[PDB]
Amino acid sequence: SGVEGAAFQSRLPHDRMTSQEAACFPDIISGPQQTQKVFLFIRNRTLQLWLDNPKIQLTFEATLQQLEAPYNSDTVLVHRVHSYLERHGLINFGIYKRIKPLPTKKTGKVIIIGSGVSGLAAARQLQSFGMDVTLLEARDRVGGRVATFRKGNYVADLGAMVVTGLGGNPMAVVSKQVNMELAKIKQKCPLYEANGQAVPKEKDEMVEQEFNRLLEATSYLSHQLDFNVLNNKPVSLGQALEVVIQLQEKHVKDEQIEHWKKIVKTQEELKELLNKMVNLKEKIKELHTAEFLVKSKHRDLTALCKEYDELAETQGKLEEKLQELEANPPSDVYLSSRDRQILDWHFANLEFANATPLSTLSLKHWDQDDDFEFTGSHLTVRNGYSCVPVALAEGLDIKLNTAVRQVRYTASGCEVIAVNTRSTSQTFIYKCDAVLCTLPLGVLKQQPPAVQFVPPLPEWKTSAVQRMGFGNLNKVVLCFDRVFWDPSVNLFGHVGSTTASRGELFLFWNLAPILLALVAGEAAGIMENISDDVIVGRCLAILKGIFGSSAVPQPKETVVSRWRADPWARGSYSYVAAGSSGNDYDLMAQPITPPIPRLFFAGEHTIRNYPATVHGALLSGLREAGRIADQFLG
Ligand SMILES: Cc1cc2nc3c(=O)[nH]c(=O)nc-3n(C[C@H](O)[C@H](O)[C@H](O)COP(=O)(O)OP(=O)(O)OC[C@H]3O[C@@H](n4cnc5c(N)ncnc54)[C@H](O)[C@@H]3O)c2cc1C
Questions:
Q1: Whose CA is nearest to atom 13 of ligand 1?
Q2: What are φ and ψ of residue 567, in 5° steps?
Q3: Which reaction does it catalyse?
Q4: Which of 139, 147, 244, 314 is the most buried (most CB within 10 A)?
Q5: Which residues approach ligand 1 with their CB closer than 6 A?
Q6: Are strands 397-399 and 452-454 parallel, antiparallel or unpaired?
Q7: Separation of alpha carbons 277 and 593, rounded Å
Q8: Beta strand segments in 52-126, E
């Protein structure tokens, strides 16, 4: 599975041609299947050669010399496959030693707005393709939403921190190229209630199980029964979850009522059987030849005692049924008050991963990209994720503290206007043939706008911008000079007191003596209005309740993100809002033409299968580089 592995690691089926390939190789698709098999092998083998050694450029010549007979004889097919893989960034992407040209002459000028991972990835491709490219970045650093805090021996990521599995992840290649150290995240996450006591194992698993059944029930309601619209409004995941919970509570109350009726019935029978027994005793009373009269009262009294003694047995078969029934009552409630708070911790955790309250997520599409998840454990970046954007910036023409304010594009070229953010007096004007916009969705949604488009973007584009969600989440970095927590535990949770505030500092994690506290959901935007000192104080109180007031010292350093207030972000990353879908991600990727595409788009919000991630941003950049090169360089 070597060549089979290369296709998989490249997100491609090893045994068939993708739609994109069919388009580029119409003669292969509509030809001898035997040729397709040769195409797929050359493609898979070329990807393998690249994947086995991504720190060095894989040339056409070298691909040909390493292919085996007969493949090494079809020079022309190999060239076409290598050119295709290269143009689209499946090989020779990221950071690697070139071993050939980098023509001193440059064809075409492209301006790239934003120097985040998508802009950086696209730039390296475009430059290696021989175009003249310049990146305009508003901040005084590269990386965008990859933002690493570094002081002394302290390292912590305020932006992206997790590599979500290596299997199929292009970040696996990049990780090798920049030598970024990755470490698995242990899953064990003990939970502590608001009073500091740990949630027992049995309870933990019970609630988690319900969390899972609840989500599965909404998935069933949505994709099997199609209940995605109600009162002419798209249903949200949070809305559906609350209804499923209501049904559970109704069911519990129903079974409770039936059990009470069983009790009351049994009680009524006992009461009645008792009354007839009392009346029979009274009959036995009254009832209480001479020789014959004796035998006669005998058969009479014994007939009434064959009646009464028996009545006492059917009575014992009732007092038995009763006492059982009320020893085996059904559940009193679906979720106890505490149980619900623990369930809210799992919802808070989901709001964290999705960067938004559950009531804003599309029930039908929120998890639209699951089928593309990578395989493998999730890893964290020991030395800080900024090592990637920093290494990708090597050798590019990047203009920092340069905030773009207007993008003008015509059938003859474009102009990008920006201003120095250190001296808002001077305004630069950069002319070019094409503009690649990597501005965050949050910035594109800004009202009044942060950057004007002349002409204004089409309605089909802006309405997509408006429908799509742009979430938020924050982190508080607590640097200590000591480790007072369990070092064999990477994560531990804090169960809040209310549903509304379930996302407040609900999670803590480590890996130096550093703890990060996470703020999710509704709490994420609200907490940004609290000073660092006060938020830090709330963290310590929580930690003190867990570990003990004397075990928790004051932090040496703290850093608090406020992604929604950050003007260059306006949030953390997108999410499929109620009323949107995977299609808006495609609409966001569509280039704008004045009869030749001039304005292009990349960014995590323009890639349908991998949104809201660093790998998605990277792939979107590789994608646009290819589309732009195809237009200008042929
Ligand atoms: C808190 C947080 C946690 C996250 N965790 C993870 C994670 O664990 N794993 C994962 O894979 N992803 C994670 N993500 C998402 C991931 O970081 C992003 O999807 C990705 O980095 C986006 O890259 P981008 O190039 O699309 O956008 P950006 O990185 O935002 O790049 C856009 C650039 O445009 C610049 N800019 C803005 N306005 C202007 C202007 N007017 N003129 C010029 N420049 C401008 C911005 O400064 C920025 O540099 C997280 C994001 C956040 C914020």
A1: 160
A2: -65, -20
A3: N(6),N(6)-dimethyl-L-lysyl(4)-[histone H3] + 2 A + 2 H2O = L-lysyl(4)-[histone H3] + 2 formaldehyde + 2 AH2
A4: 147
A5: 113-119, 136-139, 144-146, 159-162, 403-404, 438-440, 443, 450-451, 473, 563, 568-569, 572-573, 603-604, 612-615, 617
A6: unpaired
A7: 97
A8: 109-113
Q: Go through 148-168 and write b for each residue having 16 or more CB atoms within 10 A of its CB, e for each that does not.
A: bbeeeebbbbbbbbbbbbbeb
Ligand 1 centroid distance, CA of 227 (Å): 34
Closest C-alpha among 86, 87, 72, 9 to residue 41: 72
The DSSP result for 247-283, as a single string, is HHHHHHHHHHHHHHHHHHHHHHHHHHHHHHHHHHHHH
Strands 507-509, 514-519: pairing is antiparallel
Q: Which CATH class is domain 1-108?
A: mainly alpha
Quick one: CA dihedral 221, 226, 231, 235, positive or negative? positive
Q: Do domains 1-108 and 235-335 have the same CATH topology?
A: no
Task: Specify the DSSP element, H or E, that contains 127.
Answer: helix 117-128
What does the alpha-carbon distance between residue 600 and residue 131 come to, in Å, rounded to a whole number?
A: 15
Q: Crossing angle of helices 75-87/614-632, nearest 10°?
A: 120
SS3 for 332-357, per residue? CCCCCHHHHHHHHHHHHHHHHHHCCC
Give 396's contacts (C-beta < 8 A, 6+ positions apart). Answer: 120, 123, 124, 127, 133, 135
Q: Find the 143 Cα to ligand 1 centroid distance in Å.
A: 7
* Residue 588 counted as an annotated binding residue: no
Which of 145, 351, 386 to mutate to test ligand 1, by most ligand atoms within 8 A of the CB atom?
A: 145
Phi-psi sector, 573: left (phi>0), alpha (psi -120 to 50), beta: beta
* 136 CA to centre of own chain: 29
Ligand 1 centroid to 518 CA: how many Å? 18
The CATH number assigned to the domain with range 235-335 reads 1.10.287.80
In angstroms, the CA 260 to CA 303 distance is 37
Give the Cα separation of 254 and 256 in Å (integer): 5
Structure obtained using: X-ray
- Which two structure tokens, joined as six digits, stand for 406? 């207007």
Q: How far is CA 253 from the centre of its chain?
A: 35
Instruction: For residues 274 and 283, give the distance between their C-alpha atoms in angstroms, rounded to a whole number.
Output: 14
Ligand 1 atom closest to Cα of residue 563: 53
Residue 145 labelled as part of a binding site = yes
Could you identify the residue written with the tokens 């990146």? Answer: 135
Give burial (CB, 10 Å; 0-12/13-18/19+) of 314. Answer: exposed
- State both tokens at 525: 């935007």
Q: How many angstroms does the Cα of residue 613 sit away from the middle of ligand 1?
A: 9
Site to probe by mutation for ligand 1, drawn from 113, 573, 623 as the one with most ligand atoms within 8 Å of Cβ, is 573
Q: What SS3 state is found at 551?
A: coil
The domain limits of the chain are: 1-108, 109-234+336-634, 235-335
41, 64 Cβ separation under 8 angstroms: no
Q: Outline where DSSP puts E strands in 182-321.
A: 182-184, 191-192, 229-230, 233-234
